[PDB]
Amino acid sequence: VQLVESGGGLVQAGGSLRLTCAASAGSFRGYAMGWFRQAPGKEREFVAAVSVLTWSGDSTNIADSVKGRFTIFRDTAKNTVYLQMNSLKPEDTAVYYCNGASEIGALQSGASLWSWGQGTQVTV
Amino acid sequence: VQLVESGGGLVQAGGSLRLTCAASAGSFRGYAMGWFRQAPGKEREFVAAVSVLTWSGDSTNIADSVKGRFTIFRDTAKNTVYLQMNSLKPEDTAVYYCNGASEIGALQSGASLWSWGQGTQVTVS
Amino acid sequence: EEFPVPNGFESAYREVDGVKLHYVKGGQGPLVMLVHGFGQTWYEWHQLMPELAKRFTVIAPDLPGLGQSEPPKTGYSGEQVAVYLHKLARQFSPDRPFDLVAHDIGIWNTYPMVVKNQADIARLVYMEAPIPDARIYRFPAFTAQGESLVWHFSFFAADDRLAETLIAGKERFFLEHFIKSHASNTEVFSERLLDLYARSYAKPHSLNASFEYYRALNESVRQNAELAKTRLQMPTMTLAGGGHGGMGTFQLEQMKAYAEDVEGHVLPGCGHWLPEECAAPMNRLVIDFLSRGR
Amino acid sequence: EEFPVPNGFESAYREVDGVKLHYVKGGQGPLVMLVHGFGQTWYEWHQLMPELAKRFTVIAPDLPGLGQSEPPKTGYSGEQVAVYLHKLARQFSPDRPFDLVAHDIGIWNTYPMVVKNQADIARLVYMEAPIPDARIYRFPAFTAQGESLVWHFSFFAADDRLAETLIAGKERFFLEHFIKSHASNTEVFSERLLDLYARSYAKPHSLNASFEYYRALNESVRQNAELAKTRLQMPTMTLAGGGHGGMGTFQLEQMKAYAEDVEGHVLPGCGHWLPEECAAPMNRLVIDFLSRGR
């Protein structure tokens, strides 16, 4: 699977952005998907995760630092993943990456399945 | 609404019966429905109730006296209500009646909206 | 004209943001806008309109893409659609607040206008549908009574144009099943009334638009998560059916999380289609709520 | 013949309680019966059967009304249908227990046999479906990802023959959407494979029979409430897909309430259609579980 992020840019505090995660090769339809971010100086850290859809429904987990401002969701027709970022803060400035795992708990613990894509720059 | 019960009869202990509740005039589609029973000598008592179907789903309440043995369900194409009676006991012997209310809680409290029908006799030998 | 227009009312059109909206209007006085829901058009209000028109100017639009209104050019999410309805109402009441009555997806397509422009709304009546939020993800697919009341959400939202492909040519059959399965008082829907609604929904752009509202529902949910940080401050009334097919107590219980000042009524023996199934009691409640104190 | 028969296997019929059942049979040794689910036929087992036939007598029937099997004469509830499948298996293993593998509604149509005739079942493999009970009333109609995986329960159970009327003549289109929407590896289904399944299901009695299984689901739930007072004692394995379209952890968690001795596996990246989507790992697991200690 080859991951491609997009949608980053420069925004003012309180503004909003929507990030897109797509597969330029392969498919992550069969896997939970997550967003991670890395500020210059820090290591990459978990932001949000969304499970696959099962007959019982689905599950999401959102990091406390962005809870109430960011949401994650999937499009099962396009096989894409999105990060909607509302109420942006300067401390949200980072490169944002998506990756997958067999379950959202693995993403919550920093684990992932594929090589990292280039990420997308968000500057607030 | 004119209520008509049917399906009663003489059956052996451990056997099973299914009662039908129908409207010969009017309709109880818009209302929660319940089953009641009364033996000659005793008071009339609530047996089971089922709500209307809402967007959130439905709800039932089964009297403790028959919990684990009787179930209630509705057919929304026929606008009928059923009482499935499994593991019948002699003390289940009674005339069984159906009636409606705006919600199952009212039925649990013995309240109901319409004149009683003739009921259907259940005798467990 | 797709439906008979009541005596004293005009059927007319007005371009709003590049989209030609159809509406029926009559009466004199302060403005009340009535917004229909899925499976119907402005015509569902045709029994309430002459009564309200004795004291109010009454306007009943067709939702974009439905009835005789052109589809929206922006999109079908609640916030996008609300723009059209808000601008239409302001063209007729630019200097005073107006009242709003909405049924079913009429709620989805007005809540953003209401919450963002509270000074424009005097009183609010919402009936028989959830405001789009995460509560709708709890409704069951299947029930102990069989066919659930909300499975169409997913059918309509399905990709590959599933719903258009299956329903095209069977619009009348699907709509009769849909309407009757959501009703307690099923007899009020005559063969001819069903033919009129089916004729309207069978227009290709109306068949598609119907389903695009549900395809935009998850975006509406995301929009409303932000918008609902501001509570509604104007007097509000909710109505729900208490029979098979209705919302029951959900309508008022959800509304209490969105509005400070809300009164709710559940109409016993009535299903989803209050204006047609329970016309006299519902009309009285609406007229009463909008007339009191004026 | 609706599907190609593997070399070494025979396509045949047997009348059970007045109903002519189709099956494909091959191999030698103790009996294993494989029971397909909705949207498919015996043919979904055609990759597993030649492997199992190296050590087992393998039989794959078509469910009553589906594939090339006649409709049932009693009804479509699990307890009624299970009668046919049990008698068929006993015709080929009347003196010794047999193994059972079932998928999707294959589970609905075998559980009552299994629990009522535990001495006849040596091992049990259940994959990708709930056993009918009240837990299925909790599956959501609509999700934050759009179209849910379970809305078809109510669509198929609807009265007025809604599903037949809308799908007839469009079986190939509907089946492709249904299969792919419940799949993670959506492209494994060749155009010809989908053509063959649609052709089978487009037979008027097979289209109707398909939906009667769902119209009987509430009765199956009620039956199983009584039957599940006896827990299953034989060795059991559950398999579920861990990707989009699968049951995930639900499969094993529900099974733990029905069986004392259960091992479960979730196949990552795989949806509902394990035999096709993830053939090699699934086949290995079944063969291993059935081969063990023998």
Side-chain angles (χ1 to χ4, degrees), chain C residues 136-148 150-151 153-155 157-162 165-168 170 173-174 177 214 217-218 222, chain D residues 136-148 150-151 153-155 157-162 165-168 170 173-174 177 214 217-218 222:
Chain C
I136 72 175
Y137 304 141
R138 300 285 83 188
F139 295 147
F142 187 66
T143 78
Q145 300 192 21
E147 179 189 3
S148 79
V150 187
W151 69 266
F153 281 30
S154 283
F155 182 30
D159 71 338
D160 291 326
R161 297 275 216 259
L162 185 70
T165 303
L166 296 194
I167 294 166
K170 302 304 208 332
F173 177 80
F174 176 78
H177 176 88
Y214 297 78
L217 189 49
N218 286 324
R222 290 190 290 269
Chain D
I136 74 176
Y137 303 137
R138 297 218 114 185
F139 297 156
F142 184 67
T143 78
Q145 302 192 21
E147 181 190 5
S148 78
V150 192
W151 71 269
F153 280 28
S154 283
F155 182 31
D159 68 337
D160 295 328
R161 280 133 297 268
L162 186 71
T165 301
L166 297 191
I167 294 169
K170 309 163 197 147
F173 174 79
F174 179 82
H177 177 87
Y214 297 79
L217 189 49
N218 284 322
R222 289 191 292 270

XYZ file of all heavy atoms in Angstrom, chain C residues 136-148 150-151 153-155 157-162 165-168 170 173-174 177 214 217-218 222, chain D residues 136-148 150-151 153-155 157-162 165-168 170 173-174 177 214 217-218 222:
614
model
N -28.560 9.287 15.397
C -29.158 8.523 14.307
C -28.396 7.233 14.020
O -28.938 6.341 13.351
C -29.253 9.334 13.001
C -27.868 9.519 12.366
C -29.966 10.667 13.217
C -27.952 10.221 11.011
N -27.139 7.129 14.471
C -26.337 5.918 14.315
C -26.726 4.838 15.308
O -26.138 3.754 15.279
C -24.834 6.223 14.473
C -24.331 7.299 13.525
C -23.405 8.253 13.948
C -24.771 7.358 12.217
C -22.973 9.232 13.091
C -24.334 8.328 11.354
C -23.429 9.263 11.802
O -22.970 10.235 10.943
N -27.688 5.106 16.182
C -28.154 4.122 17.147
C -29.453 3.449 16.712
O -29.808 2.414 17.276
C -28.403 4.782 18.513
C -27.228 5.485 19.231
C -26.173 4.597 19.887
N -25.124 4.074 19.018
C -24.239 3.163 19.416
N -24.255 2.676 20.649
N -23.299 2.756 18.566
N -30.163 4.007 15.732
C -31.414 3.419 15.254
C -31.166 2.009 14.710
O -30.198 1.806 13.953
C -32.021 4.299 14.150
C -32.455 5.685 14.613
C -32.364 6.777 13.748
C -32.920 5.896 15.897
C -32.762 8.047 14.147
C -33.322 7.170 16.316
C -33.242 8.250 15.440
N -32.006 1.017 15.065
C -31.769 -0.377 14.620
C -32.111 -0.636 13.154
O -33.129 -0.170 12.626
C -32.695 -1.197 15.528
C -33.854 -0.244 15.768
C -33.165 1.102 15.975
N -31.286 -1.479 12.528
C -31.530 -1.890 11.147
C -32.741 -2.804 11.016
O -33.444 -2.774 9.996
C -30.297 -2.592 10.604
N -32.960 -3.656 12.008
C -33.968 -4.699 11.978
C -34.550 -4.800 13.377
O -33.868 -4.487 14.354
C -33.326 -6.027 11.552
C -34.300 -7.138 11.337
C -35.221 -7.067 10.308
C -34.267 -8.280 12.140
C -36.108 -8.105 10.080
C -35.166 -9.316 11.930
C -36.079 -9.226 10.885
N -35.822 -5.180 13.480
C -36.495 -5.149 14.780
C -37.277 -6.431 15.028
O -37.539 -7.216 14.115
C -37.444 -3.946 14.892
O -38.660 -4.231 14.178
C -36.769 -2.684 14.327
N -37.686 -6.617 16.287
C -38.534 -7.756 16.614
C -39.902 -7.664 15.947
O -40.655 -8.638 15.964
C -38.686 -7.869 18.141
N -40.241 -6.524 15.356
C -41.458 -6.385 14.574
C -41.178 -6.469 13.084
O -42.076 -6.222 12.282
C -42.153 -5.065 14.912
C -42.562 -4.951 16.409
C -43.505 -3.770 16.709
O -44.174 -3.251 15.821
N -43.577 -3.378 17.973
N -39.954 -6.822 12.702
C -39.589 -6.929 11.304
C -38.960 -5.665 10.752
O -38.177 -4.997 11.446
N -39.301 -5.332 9.512
C -38.802 -4.156 8.807
C -38.757 -2.930 9.705
O -39.782 -2.509 10.240
C -39.700 -3.852 7.593
C -39.216 -2.605 6.836
C -40.171 -2.112 5.738
O -41.274 -2.696 5.562
O -39.807 -1.120 5.057
N -37.566 -2.353 9.866
C -37.399 -1.138 10.661
C -37.835 0.105 9.884
O -38.074 0.066 8.679
C -35.953 -0.979 11.096
O -35.186 -0.476 10.020
N -35.969 2.911 9.596
C -34.821 3.727 9.229
C -33.869 3.016 8.267
O -32.910 3.629 7.812
C -34.073 4.187 10.508
C -32.943 5.188 10.218
C -35.053 4.827 11.515
N -34.170 1.783 7.835
C -33.253 1.114 6.903
C -33.063 1.888 5.597
O -32.006 1.775 4.964
C -33.707 -0.327 6.624
C -34.963 -0.466 5.829
C -36.227 -0.621 6.308
C -35.066 -0.484 4.396
N -37.122 -0.752 5.255
C -36.430 -0.648 4.074
C -34.136 -0.372 3.355
C -36.883 -0.713 2.753
C -34.581 -0.435 2.049
C -35.944 -0.601 1.756
N -32.348 4.920 5.196
C -31.183 5.802 5.297
C -29.999 5.236 4.524
O -29.385 5.934 3.715
C -30.775 6.026 6.748
C -31.628 7.043 7.502
C -32.966 7.242 7.195
C -31.069 7.784 8.542
C -33.750 8.163 7.924
C -31.847 8.711 9.272
C -33.180 8.890 8.955
N -29.668 3.961 4.772
C -28.539 3.302 4.113
C -28.832 2.946 2.655
O -27.965 3.111 1.792
C -28.164 2.038 4.882
O -27.441 2.376 6.056
N -30.038 2.442 2.355
C -30.430 2.194 0.967
C -30.226 3.452 0.120
O -29.582 3.421 -0.942
C -31.895 1.739 0.954
C -32.446 1.403 -0.405
C -31.630 0.906 -1.411
C -33.792 1.577 -0.660
C -32.138 0.603 -2.660
C -34.330 1.270 -1.921
C -33.486 0.778 -2.929
N -28.422 6.114 0.881
C -27.047 6.588 0.879
C -26.115 5.674 0.093
O -24.963 6.058 -0.137
C -26.526 6.730 2.314
N -26.577 4.484 -0.319
C -25.686 3.528 -0.971
C -25.117 4.115 -2.257
O -25.777 4.881 -2.965
C -26.412 2.214 -1.267
N -23.878 3.753 -2.556
C -23.225 4.252 -3.758
C -23.700 3.452 -4.977
O -24.632 2.642 -4.907
C -21.706 4.266 -3.560
C -21.091 2.880 -3.526
O -21.795 1.891 -3.236
O -19.878 2.774 -3.794
N -23.079 3.702 -6.126
C -23.394 3.028 -7.384
C -24.781 3.393 -7.884
O -25.309 2.704 -8.754
C -23.274 1.501 -7.260
C -21.817 1.029 -7.086
O -20.908 1.659 -7.667
O -21.579 0.059 -6.318
N -25.389 4.445 -7.341
C -26.765 4.839 -7.669
C -27.735 3.678 -7.471
O -28.671 3.478 -8.250
C -26.836 5.391 -9.087
C -26.010 6.658 -9.268
C -26.749 7.935 -8.880
N -26.354 9.007 -9.803
C -25.466 9.965 -9.548
N -24.907 10.095 -8.356
N -25.094 10.785 -10.531
N -27.508 2.910 -6.398
C -28.329 1.735 -6.116
C -29.816 2.068 -6.080
O -30.628 1.371 -6.698
C -27.903 1.121 -4.786
C -28.590 -0.178 -4.405
C -28.111 -1.308 -5.317
C -28.310 -0.480 -2.925
N -31.373 3.098 -9.426
C -31.444 1.960 -10.336
C -32.592 1.027 -9.958
O -33.331 0.571 -10.830
C -30.120 1.215 -10.341
O -29.074 2.122 -10.708
C -30.154 0.063 -11.340
N -32.769 0.744 -8.664
C -33.837 -0.165 -8.260
C -35.219 0.482 -8.302
O -36.200 -0.194 -8.617
C -33.601 -0.715 -6.848
C -32.372 -1.598 -6.601
C -32.464 -2.340 -5.240
C -32.105 -2.547 -7.752
N -35.338 1.764 -7.956
C -36.675 2.363 -7.824
C -37.207 2.950 -9.140
O -38.422 3.052 -9.322
C -36.643 3.413 -6.690
C -36.407 2.709 -5.346
C -37.901 4.259 -6.635
C -36.034 3.698 -4.235
N -36.334 3.359 -10.053
C -36.792 3.945 -11.317
C -37.774 3.008 -12.030
O -37.496 1.824 -12.233
C -35.597 4.259 -12.214
N -40.548 2.123 -10.688
C -41.375 1.588 -9.614
C -41.589 2.623 -8.527
O -41.802 2.260 -7.362
C -40.766 0.319 -9.007
C -40.537 -0.828 -10.005
C -41.836 -1.163 -10.690
C -41.903 -2.626 -11.151
N -40.549 -3.180 -11.431
N -44.895 2.275 -6.590
C -44.897 1.119 -5.689
C -44.000 1.370 -4.477
O -44.370 1.054 -3.337
C -44.448 -0.132 -6.448
C -44.341 -1.357 -5.596
C -45.475 -2.086 -5.272
C -43.116 -1.775 -5.099
C -45.396 -3.224 -4.468
C -43.031 -2.933 -4.298
C -44.180 -3.644 -3.986
N -42.808 1.909 -4.694
C -41.931 2.134 -3.555
C -42.542 3.153 -2.601
O -42.533 2.961 -1.384
C -40.545 2.600 -3.995
C -39.665 2.922 -2.829
C -39.059 1.899 -2.110
C -39.486 4.234 -2.412
C -38.271 2.185 -0.998
C -38.700 4.516 -1.304
C -38.119 3.490 -0.595
N -45.412 1.799 -0.372
C -44.855 1.010 0.724
C -44.184 1.915 1.750
O -44.423 1.791 2.956
C -43.843 -0.010 0.202
C -43.171 -0.773 1.305
N -43.702 -1.929 1.827
C -42.062 -0.503 2.037
C -42.942 -2.351 2.822
N -41.933 -1.508 2.966
N -29.833 12.125 1.679
C -29.322 11.089 2.582
C -27.850 10.823 2.343
O -27.141 10.432 3.270
C -30.123 9.792 2.420
C -31.565 9.987 2.791
C -32.438 10.601 1.901
C -32.048 9.604 4.044
C -33.744 10.818 2.227
C -33.358 9.802 4.369
C -34.201 10.417 3.467
O -35.523 10.643 3.770
N -26.075 13.208 4.507
C -26.444 13.188 5.920
C -25.222 13.162 6.843
O -25.208 13.835 7.883
C -27.372 11.998 6.168
C -28.095 11.823 7.498
C -28.771 13.121 7.873
C -29.111 10.702 7.366
N -24.185 12.394 6.502
C -23.033 12.370 7.402
C -22.304 13.709 7.432
O -21.713 14.069 8.459
C -22.073 11.252 7.031
C -22.604 9.893 7.431
O -23.251 9.736 8.474
N -22.322 8.908 6.616
N -21.710 16.204 10.774
C -20.447 16.875 11.105
C -20.636 18.386 11.240
O -20.084 19.017 12.156
C -19.395 16.540 10.048
C -18.954 15.103 10.116
C -17.735 14.799 9.233
N -18.056 14.857 7.815
C -18.455 13.816 7.097
N -18.582 12.615 7.633
N -18.703 13.977 5.808
N -29.149 -9.225 17.100
C -29.259 -8.661 15.765
C -30.152 -7.428 15.761
O -30.104 -6.652 14.806
C -29.775 -9.702 14.757
C -31.253 -9.959 14.956
C -28.995 -11.037 14.884
C -31.803 -10.907 13.909
N -30.983 -7.232 16.794
C -31.804 -6.018 16.858
C -31.008 -4.794 17.291
O -31.569 -3.701 17.376
C -33.001 -6.212 17.800
C -33.872 -7.385 17.419
C -34.363 -8.265 18.387
C -34.181 -7.632 16.088
C -35.152 -9.349 18.033
C -34.972 -8.702 15.723
C -35.447 -9.564 16.704
O -36.222 -10.637 16.330
N -29.743 -4.961 17.569
C -28.898 -3.868 17.947
C -27.993 -3.353 16.821
O -27.416 -2.321 16.948
C -28.063 -4.250 19.152
C -28.878 -4.540 20.398
C -28.168 -4.008 21.626
N -28.904 -2.918 22.251
C -28.460 -2.205 23.277
N -27.268 -2.457 23.787
N -29.208 -1.234 23.787
N -27.882 -4.084 15.732
C -27.092 -3.628 14.595
C -27.673 -2.321 14.046
O -28.891 -2.223 13.870
C -27.073 -4.687 13.492
C -26.416 -5.986 13.878
C -26.756 -7.163 13.212
C -25.427 -6.033 14.859
C -26.136 -8.371 13.528
C -24.804 -7.246 15.193
C -25.158 -8.411 14.520
N -26.848 -1.310 13.755
C -27.385 -0.005 13.321
C -27.912 0.022 11.888
O -27.353 -0.587 10.974
C -26.179 0.929 13.481
C -25.007 0.023 13.238
C -25.388 -1.250 13.958
N -28.978 0.793 11.691
C -29.509 0.979 10.341
C -28.559 1.792 9.463
O -28.505 1.586 8.245
C -30.875 1.671 10.407
N -27.870 2.771 10.046
C -27.064 3.747 9.320
C -25.826 4.062 10.159
O -25.884 4.023 11.386
C -27.903 5.026 9.058
C -27.203 6.061 8.220
C -26.908 5.806 6.875
C -26.824 7.282 8.777
C -26.250 6.759 6.105
C -26.168 8.249 8.012
C -25.876 7.973 6.666
N -24.703 4.375 9.512
C -23.438 4.548 10.238
C -22.738 5.836 9.825
O -23.099 6.469 8.831
C -22.483 3.357 9.998
O -21.866 3.488 8.704
C -23.249 2.040 10.054
N -21.700 6.216 10.597
C -20.859 7.357 10.223
C -20.032 7.095 8.970
O -19.380 8.019 8.467
C -19.932 7.774 11.367
N -20.016 5.863 8.473
C -19.380 5.549 7.206
C -20.395 5.421 6.086
O -20.051 4.960 4.994
C -18.562 4.261 7.337
C -17.497 4.352 8.435
C -16.486 3.207 8.393
O -16.297 2.547 7.358
N -15.832 2.973 9.516
N -21.649 5.794 6.342
C -22.672 5.678 5.321
C -23.445 4.380 5.407
O -23.778 3.914 6.504
N -23.727 3.789 4.243
C -24.451 2.527 4.107
C -23.949 1.472 5.092
O -22.780 1.068 5.050
C -24.300 2.003 2.665
C -25.054 0.698 2.424
C -24.742 0.013 1.091
O -23.853 0.502 0.348
O -25.412 -1.015 0.786
N -24.844 0.999 5.958
C -24.509 -0.056 6.897
C -24.517 -1.413 6.196
O -24.940 -1.550 5.050
C -25.497 -0.073 8.058
O -26.656 -0.695 7.587
N -26.127 -4.054 7.310
C -27.250 -4.836 7.777
C -28.647 -4.329 7.358
O -29.627 -4.964 7.615
C -27.114 -5.038 9.290
C -28.066 -6.064 9.803
C -25.714 -5.455 9.643
N -28.705 -3.195 6.691
C -29.960 -2.679 6.201
C -30.786 -3.651 5.361
O -31.992 -3.579 5.343
C -29.762 -1.355 5.463
C -29.109 -1.419 4.188
C -27.825 -1.307 3.977
C -29.708 -1.572 2.914
N -27.533 -1.378 2.676
C -28.685 -1.539 1.982
C -31.006 -1.734 2.470
C -28.909 -1.670 0.632
C -31.224 -1.857 1.141
C -30.185 -1.827 0.231
N -31.440 -6.679 5.919
C -32.365 -7.482 6.733
C -33.802 -6.982 6.585
O -34.726 -7.766 6.345
C -31.981 -7.455 8.219
C -30.851 -8.403 8.609
C -29.873 -8.785 7.707
C -30.748 -8.855 9.911
C -28.836 -9.629 8.092
C -29.710 -9.705 10.308
C -28.760 -10.095 9.402
N -34.012 -5.672 6.784
C -35.359 -5.103 6.725
C -35.860 -4.986 5.292
O -37.061 -5.150 5.037
C -35.383 -3.740 7.402
O -35.389 -3.888 8.810
N -34.973 -4.625 4.359
C -35.344 -4.604 2.942
C -35.891 -5.954 2.515
O -36.994 -6.043 1.963
C -34.122 -4.218 2.108
C -34.371 -4.110 0.609
C -35.591 -3.722 0.103
C -33.327 -4.369 -0.287
C -35.790 -3.601 -1.270
C -33.512 -4.243 -1.655
C -34.754 -3.859 -2.147
N -36.913 -8.392 4.490
C -38.071 -8.815 5.287
C -39.336 -8.017 5.012
O -40.387 -8.360 5.564
C -37.785 -8.709 6.786
N -39.257 -6.931 4.254
C -40.427 -6.076 4.063
C -41.559 -6.838 3.391
O -41.345 -7.732 2.564
C -40.062 -4.834 3.238
N -42.780 -6.491 3.778
C -43.944 -7.085 3.151
C -44.130 -6.464 1.770
O -43.291 -5.692 1.288
C -45.180 -6.905 4.036
C -45.619 -5.461 4.152
O -44.778 -4.566 3.946
O -46.804 -5.201 4.471
N -45.228 -6.821 1.112
C -45.573 -6.306 -0.207
C -44.601 -6.781 -1.274
O -44.562 -6.196 -2.368
C -45.602 -4.777 -0.216
C -46.675 -4.228 0.663
O -47.723 -4.894 0.796
O -46.447 -3.147 1.258
N -43.801 -7.792 -0.951
C -42.768 -8.267 -1.861
C -41.949 -7.098 -2.403
O -41.720 -6.998 -3.608
C -43.390 -9.054 -3.016
C -43.744 -10.490 -2.668
C -45.148 -10.841 -3.133
N -46.164 -10.035 -2.460
C -46.781 -10.394 -1.340
N -46.488 -11.550 -0.760
N -47.693 -9.597 -0.799
N -41.513 -6.214 -1.510
C -40.745 -5.043 -1.917
C -39.470 -5.437 -2.645
O -39.195 -4.943 -3.745
C -40.396 -4.182 -0.698
C -39.723 -2.857 -1.059
C -40.754 -1.917 -1.715
C -39.027 -2.190 0.169
N -39.870 -7.074 -6.144
C -40.410 -6.132 -7.112
C -39.340 -5.166 -7.591
O -39.292 -4.829 -8.785
C -41.589 -5.365 -6.498
O -42.610 -6.281 -6.100
C -42.170 -4.346 -7.476
N -38.502 -4.674 -6.666
C -37.440 -3.744 -7.016
C -36.253 -4.439 -7.674
O -35.572 -3.821 -8.502
C -36.964 -2.959 -5.780
C -38.001 -2.036 -5.105
C -37.336 -1.136 -4.081
C -38.805 -1.200 -6.089
N -35.942 -5.680 -7.291
C -34.717 -6.298 -7.789
C -34.926 -7.120 -9.068
O -33.986 -7.282 -9.854
C -34.070 -7.129 -6.667
C -33.594 -6.191 -5.534
C -32.889 -7.978 -7.175
C -33.189 -6.941 -4.274
N -36.131 -7.652 -9.295
C -36.375 -8.517 -10.450
C -35.930 -7.854 -11.750
O -36.277 -6.701 -12.030
C -37.857 -8.896 -10.535
N -32.969 -6.966 -12.302
C -31.764 -6.217 -11.987
C -30.889 -7.011 -11.023
O -30.123 -6.431 -10.246
C -32.134 -4.861 -11.386
C -33.149 -4.036 -12.206
C -33.766 -2.939 -11.344
C -35.034 -2.370 -11.924
N -36.022 -1.953 -10.856
N -26.990 -6.454 -11.231
C -26.573 -5.183 -10.651
C -26.660 -5.218 -9.131
O -25.712 -4.833 -8.430
C -27.447 -4.061 -11.205
C -27.185 -2.737 -10.562
C -26.086 -1.976 -10.949
C -27.996 -2.276 -9.538
C -25.821 -0.751 -10.348
C -27.734 -1.051 -8.931
C -26.643 -0.292 -9.345
N -27.787 -5.698 -8.597
C -27.935 -5.706 -7.141
C -26.898 -6.620 -6.495
O -26.262 -6.245 -5.497
C -29.337 -6.150 -6.736
C -29.530 -6.207 -5.240
C -29.812 -5.057 -4.532
C -29.403 -7.400 -4.551
C -29.981 -5.086 -3.150
C -29.557 -7.434 -3.157
C -29.845 -6.273 -2.473
N -23.452 -5.065 -6.260
C -23.381 -4.090 -5.174
C -23.372 -4.778 -3.815
O -22.535 -4.471 -2.947
C -24.534 -3.104 -5.233
C -24.508 -2.145 -4.085
N -23.791 -0.971 -4.120
C -25.048 -2.219 -2.847
C -23.913 -0.348 -2.960
N -24.666 -1.089 -2.168
N -35.233 -14.210 5.224
C -35.231 -13.015 6.071
C -36.624 -12.708 6.616
O -36.753 -12.161 7.725
C -34.649 -11.822 5.285
C -33.187 -12.034 4.889
C -32.856 -12.837 3.785
C -32.144 -11.475 5.639
C -31.537 -13.063 3.422
C -30.798 -11.699 5.286
C -30.509 -12.487 4.170
O -29.193 -12.720 3.802
N -36.888 -14.573 9.774
C -35.824 -14.354 10.761
C -36.375 -14.141 12.178
O -35.817 -14.666 13.154
C -34.958 -13.176 10.309
C -33.635 -12.795 11.000
C -32.696 -13.979 11.209
C -32.912 -11.674 10.200
N -37.467 -13.382 12.321
C -38.026 -13.163 13.660
C -38.533 -14.461 14.266
O -38.433 -14.676 15.479
C -39.170 -12.154 13.615
C -38.695 -10.716 13.462
O -37.682 -10.307 14.033
N -39.441 -9.944 12.702
N -37.074 -16.355 17.730
C -37.933 -16.896 18.787
C -37.669 -18.381 19.025
O -37.693 -18.850 20.172
C -39.404 -16.653 18.453
C -39.847 -15.186 18.551
C -41.389 -15.016 18.473
N -41.935 -15.340 17.157
C -42.083 -14.455 16.179
N -41.731 -13.182 16.340
N -42.606 -14.849 15.019
